[PDB]
């Protein structure tokens, strides 16, 4: 086989220099996952309903899109009804 | 949609009184429901005998009256038929048969307000869910 | 020239090998997976089916999907900058659109993915039967996740990115397509199983006719890439076989394109199949024992009652799995055997 | 009825008999080593 | 410890103490000692989550209701009147792993690596017949007395739980065990099938005890005999004798015991009592049918005469062979049988007039009890069936019980099937391959 | 020394076919179910086997086709009970009740059990490894799993797969309705064993073929390059690996063939030992995962999943399936 | 050895994005309705 020329990923993930970067790089992304949850920005970027906007006090039908090029709206009066 | 005070809050008694359960309280005759009585009445049904719901409308015209918390927990103690015309005790969980049905022992009387309440609440929750059967699943 | 210039580093010996096929591979591919892992995680499918689809919502690995874009959105490519999102990403989730994007993106990943095969192949020095072999994937992909949806109504009753989503898939075809009754899956079935028995029973064959070069008990040490020797018996394997199952291999080169012919060929043959149910063209019925049943209310057999199955899965299945069709039904119509 | 059972039951037992003595006469002996 | 030196690699590294019988001993002493712990740390564990008010079979326990089988910790009806058994056996236990580890890591790592040069009593060579069988003769001892401890248990100290005793299940002393060879030995002797059920029926203590006196003695003289004595002639030439090759041997028997053990806890409900394990599955299923001609019977039904959709009886009709059973898909579960069910069986199967007589309140509430608690769950443990919605948290102990052996009982024929060959491809000289200079099949002639 | 003869002749490696001790039970078994097979399949009469007097046509002189037909199994009234001819009053008994299913089954069981130890007594005879047979217990196990293990657990040889294509699509619906296997991490380990059974060898099938060397010309195929028994291998593994090993990384790839081909047969074999536990586990019905109602907003309403889709489909199967033999609403048998 | 390289890339745009995700999905652990 040889070897390509990149350096042996077993010589660096034993090597100080590596995990004296990478104790405060993944940890950091870990943390900033957490945020993204905690902070609940991830409800408002994507759209996701939280556990109390799924529904009104006194609805059970779903709000489902019916229209085709309308449907930006339909979703946005939905979310004003709650 | 959220867990508001007007939902948790059941008639109390047979003549218009009621009250407001707190969410723990709700929380708390669920899990003893699940403890207690699940066995037989999952989703508000009867599996040992299907003609018999825990559906509120049916509670209601039961002989007595068993559409509030006074009715429940009352049946709780002295189970009878839906007419009332005998005690089946010796047949249904009650703390008058512990002795035969163990469960119901470590019962106190503020664990089956929270149960009692627990039934009335969930078909204001699920609708006809409660007590409708595999066809509402 | 620049041309020439850019073909050598693309084709740079590397860990990860390139090449001109990379540049539509890689981001295509990428955005694929990473498409998936996004909607899995935090996108949800409430507008579009009604339905949690997401770790967020409370879903696990088993029940996340990638959900389709609502029936009334047609066969829509549902771009961002498209006329239904017009540039709002939230809304564009919300929607469906990761859906598309990630069968398009996935769809031109393979087209990449395929090259890639043929451009190492031909730097190598070897033939391109695998990626003739790559054909069948491809092929079962465009039917089903293009194709069938197309013949369809619309996006929506394609295949959703999930596990349990593709559980749905399953029981929907039995349900309504009848898709077990259908020759062309039936190859399919036939190639793929068959596939299983001969990568087994290769396998266990070449490891049980192993030449004795070494001392060790462990034989894997035994071998040197290098080698100009076989190192099994196919002398010994070929009487063994005979003599238990009456025919035997005789010929390598033959063994092994067998191998790339049979599960090829099944999944070659399924896609066909699909093809045909996208326009609802099913191996559905029997007319002859139709009429036979009709006539003669004693007349029964394992088809007439996986028949009876379909029309409980369709009827129980359908108000929850096409909430765009509104269908409300009565407990007194669902089609119900007795005490159940 | 009875007589198919008697069948069957001797059957049986002559090839079961086969395979008993058949692997107890030096079945590891048997090898082309 | 080396594959360059051993031939083995490190996932077969095991391999290399077939001829260190030091190593070897070390390492079946603190494997030894882990089985014990798990009996001890479980015990212990299910205490701790133990609710005395609650069924056995509602808590996940399989380890308490093996115990309280023994007597021990319970009373009239199975109910809890002691915990205090239970925390016993799960300390001793666990306390014995500490001593079993203690000599299996010493043997391992620092005892001598071979026996033979040190205790020619204790030192082993696999082909000397003459001495494993005398090792197996004092492991069958073993075997025997451990027989004769239950049979000592039943008889002498304390009894058993008898969920047949009269006026309800209780711990019961067992003054006669049925020592007649012809119902004894006859177990052996009946057909695996339905109706029949082989060992698995047996469906009184007086057998069970019985059965295990002369197991008890049988291991005993056995013991005896392959100790004083050597292998056979025919044997000698019928075996493979090699260390690989009895592997192959006790691994085939423990997955047939394995297999056994499963229909054991499925099907029988005495040594296996439903008060501790839960219901089986015949017997939930023959509980519905009772829950449900009881409730329409009060409704003024005729149970009898009542016919079903496909002309057979609703409630009740008839087996194969006459006797008068349940109606349903439980037609099939016939065969059951269950203390609750039997007061109301006749010499021509289910009595009609018992019925509508002399049903009893407790066989009501015991026919509902397994009928809601039948052994159907999912894997994340919900009770019911697949399509039931999430509420009960229950799988009976008789589904993890038999799935769990299953699965091991087939691997273990697997392991049968894999050392065995090996055993035999060992011994003739051909386990690392063919002889390239001297491949047998081309000193054959052509099949054609 | 005359029943030397016989004993050398039964395993004797110069026959055409071997016979062997295993043999000596396989072959009459084996043409035992065989020939019953064939005859029921063809002019069999109904069979009830739900026992409730429904009788259901099997063979094809009453109605059927190769899709349709099948041999159907025993009554629900028999259960596991032991059904041979001698326990009948007659054959029209013996035939209404599911007689031949059990005639079958059983004689194949024990042929295709002595079918695999006759695997490693040939491989013994000729100085091969024993293993193959070991291979061969995954599809053997998954046999014994549909045939025997599951009509056990389920109290009736009624609920056995039939011996048919129709009859198997019936026993395969009305199980994940009762068991949900698709969300049964065994079947879905089965799924991944013979989907990566059948990649693995489309794959190990196109790579050798790649690297085939050179022998023939383009008016003539390439698989007579390859000469029977020869000693030089056919193709150069090294390309093949330098190619695949391109494709991904060279560390995802094998330079060892004996490494390699036992991948190939240990991936499809443990996924298919697996799917077999999976039936023979759901027969004591510890089934598949249950997520129904599993996601609650916070008012309490249910939010479905696909799982509660696929329990809707489950639904479906259940209440219609064997429409006649409920009388009582748990299902249970 | 190169330190920044086409298999660095490679591996931080499965890496980087992996382990962002696993924290995000560790905090929906504790979300509660
Ligand atoms: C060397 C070996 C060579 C063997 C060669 C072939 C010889 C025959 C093999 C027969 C195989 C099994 C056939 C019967 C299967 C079965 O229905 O066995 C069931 C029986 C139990 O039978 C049941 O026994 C019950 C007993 O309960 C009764 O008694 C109880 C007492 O409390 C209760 O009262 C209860 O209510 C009451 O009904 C009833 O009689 C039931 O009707 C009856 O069905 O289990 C038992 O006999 C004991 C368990 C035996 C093993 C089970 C089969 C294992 C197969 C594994 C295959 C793996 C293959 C892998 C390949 C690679
Ligand atoms: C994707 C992951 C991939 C992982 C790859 C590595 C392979 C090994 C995987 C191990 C399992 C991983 C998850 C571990 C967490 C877990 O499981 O945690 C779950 C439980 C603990 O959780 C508790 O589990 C309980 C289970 O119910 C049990 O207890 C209940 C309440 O008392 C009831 O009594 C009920 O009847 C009874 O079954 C309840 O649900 C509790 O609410 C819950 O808190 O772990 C336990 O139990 C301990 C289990 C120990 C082993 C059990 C051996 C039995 C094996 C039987 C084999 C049969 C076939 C199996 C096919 C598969
Ligand atoms: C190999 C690269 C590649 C490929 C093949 C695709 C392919 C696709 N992407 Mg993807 N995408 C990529 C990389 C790629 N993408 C990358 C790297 C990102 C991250 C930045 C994205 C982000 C992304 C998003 C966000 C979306 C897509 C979508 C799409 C689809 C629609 C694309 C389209 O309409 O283009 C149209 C453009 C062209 C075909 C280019 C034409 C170029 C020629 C030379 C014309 C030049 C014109 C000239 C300059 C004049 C300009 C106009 C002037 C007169 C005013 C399609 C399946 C959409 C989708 O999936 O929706 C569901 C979508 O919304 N992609
Ligand atoms: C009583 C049981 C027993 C014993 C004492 C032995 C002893 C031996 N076996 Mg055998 N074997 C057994 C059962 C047994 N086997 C069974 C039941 C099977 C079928 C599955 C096999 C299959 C088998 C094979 C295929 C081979 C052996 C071999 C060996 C030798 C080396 C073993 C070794 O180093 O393992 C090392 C142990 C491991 C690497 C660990 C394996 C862990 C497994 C795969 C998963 C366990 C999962 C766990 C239960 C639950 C999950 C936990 C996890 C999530 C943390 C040794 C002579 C080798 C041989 O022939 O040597 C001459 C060999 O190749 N055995
Ligand atoms: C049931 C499990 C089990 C047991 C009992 C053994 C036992 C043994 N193995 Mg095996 N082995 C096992 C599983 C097991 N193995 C598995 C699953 C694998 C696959 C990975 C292997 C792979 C393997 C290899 C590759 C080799 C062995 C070898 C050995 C032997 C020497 C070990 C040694 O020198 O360790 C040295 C290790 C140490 C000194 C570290 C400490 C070890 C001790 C025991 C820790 C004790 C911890 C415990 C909490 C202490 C309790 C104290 C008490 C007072 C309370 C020994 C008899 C060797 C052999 O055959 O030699 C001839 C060998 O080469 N094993
Ligand atoms: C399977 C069990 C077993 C076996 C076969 C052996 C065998 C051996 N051990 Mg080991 N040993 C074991 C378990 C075992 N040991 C355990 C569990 C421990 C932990 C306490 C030890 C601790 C140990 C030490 C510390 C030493 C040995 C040594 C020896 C050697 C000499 C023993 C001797 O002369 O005893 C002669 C007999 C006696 C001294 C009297 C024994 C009385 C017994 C124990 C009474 C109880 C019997 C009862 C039936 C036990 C039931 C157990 C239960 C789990 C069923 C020999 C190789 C010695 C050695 O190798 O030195 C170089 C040595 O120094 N062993
Ligand atoms: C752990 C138990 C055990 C083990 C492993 C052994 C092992 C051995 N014994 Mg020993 N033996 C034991 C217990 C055991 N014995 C006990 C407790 C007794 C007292 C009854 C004896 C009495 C005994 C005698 C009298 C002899 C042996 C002999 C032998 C050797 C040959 C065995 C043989 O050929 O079996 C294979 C068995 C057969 C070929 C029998 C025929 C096949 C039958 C029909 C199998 C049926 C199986 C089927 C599933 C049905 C089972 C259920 C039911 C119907 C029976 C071997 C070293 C022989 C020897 O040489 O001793 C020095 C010998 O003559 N043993
Ligand atoms: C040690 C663990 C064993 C696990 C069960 C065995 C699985 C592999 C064997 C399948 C048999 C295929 C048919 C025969 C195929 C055949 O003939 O193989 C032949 C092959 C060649 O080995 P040798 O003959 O050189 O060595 C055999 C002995 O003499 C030991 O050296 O045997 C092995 O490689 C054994 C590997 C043991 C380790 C395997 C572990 C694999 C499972 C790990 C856990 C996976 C869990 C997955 C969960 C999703
Ligand atoms: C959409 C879009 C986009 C894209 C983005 C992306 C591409 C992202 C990615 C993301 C990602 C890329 C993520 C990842 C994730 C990952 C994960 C989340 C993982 C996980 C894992 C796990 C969980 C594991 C598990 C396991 C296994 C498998 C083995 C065995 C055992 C265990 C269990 C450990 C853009 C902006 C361009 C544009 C717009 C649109
Ligand atoms: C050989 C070998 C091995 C193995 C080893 C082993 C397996 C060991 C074992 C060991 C053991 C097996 C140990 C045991 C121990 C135990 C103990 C140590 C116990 C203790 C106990 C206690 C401490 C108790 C306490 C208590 C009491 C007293 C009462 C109750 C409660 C309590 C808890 C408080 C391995 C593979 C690793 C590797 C190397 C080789
Ligand atoms: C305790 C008890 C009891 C009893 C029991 C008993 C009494 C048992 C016995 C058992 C026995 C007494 C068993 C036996 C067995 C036998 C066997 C298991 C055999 C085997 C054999 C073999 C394995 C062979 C093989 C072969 C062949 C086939 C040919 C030649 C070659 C060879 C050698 C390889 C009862 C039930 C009452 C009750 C419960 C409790
Ligand atoms: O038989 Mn044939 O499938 Ca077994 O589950 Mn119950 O039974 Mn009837 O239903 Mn579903
Ligand atoms: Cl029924
Ligand atoms: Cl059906
Ligand atoms: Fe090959």
Known sequence: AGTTGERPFSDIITSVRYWVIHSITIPALFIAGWLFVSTGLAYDVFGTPRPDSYYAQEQRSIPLVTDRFEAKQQVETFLEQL | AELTPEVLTVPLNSEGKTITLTEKQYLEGKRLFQYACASCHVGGITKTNPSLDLRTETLALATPPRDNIEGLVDYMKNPTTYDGEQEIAEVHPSLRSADIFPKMRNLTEKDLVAIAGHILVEPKILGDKWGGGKVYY | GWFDILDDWLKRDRFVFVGWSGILLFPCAYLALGGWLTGTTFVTSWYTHGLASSYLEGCNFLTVAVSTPANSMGHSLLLLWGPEAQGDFTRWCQLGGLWTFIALHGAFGLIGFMLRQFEIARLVGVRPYNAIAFSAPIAVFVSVFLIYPLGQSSWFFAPSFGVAAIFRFLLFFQGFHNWTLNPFHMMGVAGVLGGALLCAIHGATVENTLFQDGEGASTFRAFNPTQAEETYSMVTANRFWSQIFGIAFSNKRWLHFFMLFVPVTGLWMSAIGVVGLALNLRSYDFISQEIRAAEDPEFETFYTKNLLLNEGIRAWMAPQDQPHENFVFPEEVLPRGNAL | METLKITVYIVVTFFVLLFVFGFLSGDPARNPK | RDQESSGFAWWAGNARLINLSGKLLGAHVAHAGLIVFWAGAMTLFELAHFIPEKPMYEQGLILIPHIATLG????????????????????????????????????????????????????????????????????????????????????????????????????????????????????????????????????????????????????IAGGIWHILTTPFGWARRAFIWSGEAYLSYSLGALSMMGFIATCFVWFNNTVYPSEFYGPTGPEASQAQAMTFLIRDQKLGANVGSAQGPTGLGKYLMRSPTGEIIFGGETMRFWDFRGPWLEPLRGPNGLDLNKIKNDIQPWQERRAAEYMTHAPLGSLNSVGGVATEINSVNFVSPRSWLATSHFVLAFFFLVGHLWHAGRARAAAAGFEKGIDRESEPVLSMPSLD | ?????????????????????????????????????????????????????????????????????????????????????????????????????????????????????????????????????????????????????????????????????????????????????????????????????????????????????????????????????????????????????????????????????????????????????????????????????????????????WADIINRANLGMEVMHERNAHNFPLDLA | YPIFTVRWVAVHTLAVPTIFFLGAIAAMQFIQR
């Open chain 5, 72 to 219: 021990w910790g319970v009373g009239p009806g199975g109910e809890v009147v002691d915990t205090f058994p239970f925390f016993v056996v799960g300390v001793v236990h666990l306390i014995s792993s500490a001593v079993l580890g203690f000599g299996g890591v010493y043997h391992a790592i620092r005892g001598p690596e071979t026996l033979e040069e040190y205790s020619s009593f204790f030192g082993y060579d696999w082909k000397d017949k003459n001495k494993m069988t005398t090792i197996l003769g004092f492991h069958l001892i073993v075997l025997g007395i451990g027989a004769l401890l239950l049979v000592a248990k039943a008889m002498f100290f304390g009894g058993l739980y008898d969920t047949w005793a009269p006026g309800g299940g209780d711990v019961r002393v067992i003054t006669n065990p049925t020592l007649d060879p012809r119902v004894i030995f006859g177990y052996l002797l009946k057909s695996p099938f339905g109706g029949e059920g082989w060992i698995v029926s047996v469906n009184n203590l007086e057998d069970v005890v019985g059965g295990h006196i002369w197991i008890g003695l049988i291991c």
């Open chain 6, 1 to 305: 020394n005359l029943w030397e003869r016989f004993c050398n002749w039964v395993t004797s490696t110069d026959n055409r076919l071997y016979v062997g001790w295993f043999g000596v039970i396989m072959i009459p078994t084996l043409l035992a179910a065989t020939i019953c097979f064939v005859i029921a399949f063809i002019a069999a009469p109904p069979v009830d086997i739900d026992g409730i007097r429904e009788p259901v046509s099997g063979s094809l002189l009453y109605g059927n086709n190769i899709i349709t037909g099948a041999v159907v199994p025993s009554s629900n009234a028999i259960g596991l009970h032991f059904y041979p001819i001698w326990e009948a009053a007659s054959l029209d008994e013996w035939l209404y009740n599911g007689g031949p299913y059990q005639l079958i089954i059983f004689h194949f069981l024990l042929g295709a059990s002595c079918y695999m130890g006759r695997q490693w007594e040939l491989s013994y005879r000729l100085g091969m490894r024993p293993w193959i047979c070991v291979a061969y217990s995954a599809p053997l196990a998954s046999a014994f799993a549909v045939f025997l293990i599951y009509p056990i657990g389920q109290g009736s040889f009624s609920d056995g797969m039939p011996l048919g294509i129709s009859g198997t699509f019936n026993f395969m619906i009305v199980f994940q309705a009762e068991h949900n296997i698709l969300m049964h991490p065994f079947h879905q380990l089965g799924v991944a064993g013979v989907f990566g059974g059948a990649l693995f060898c489309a794959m190990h099938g196109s790579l050798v073929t790649s690297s085939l060397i050179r022998e023939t010309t383009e008016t003539e195929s390439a698989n007579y390059g390859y000469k029977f028994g020869q000693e030089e291998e056919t193709y150069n593994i090294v390309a093949a690996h330098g190619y695949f090993g391109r494709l991904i990384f060279q560390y995802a790839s094998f330079n060892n063939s004996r490494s390699l081909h036992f991948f190939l047969a240990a991936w499809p074999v443990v996924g298919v030992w697996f799917t077999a536990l999976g039936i023979s586990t759901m027969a004591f019905n510890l089934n598949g995962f249950n997520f129904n109602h599993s996601v609650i907003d916070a008012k309490g309403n249910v939010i479905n999943t």
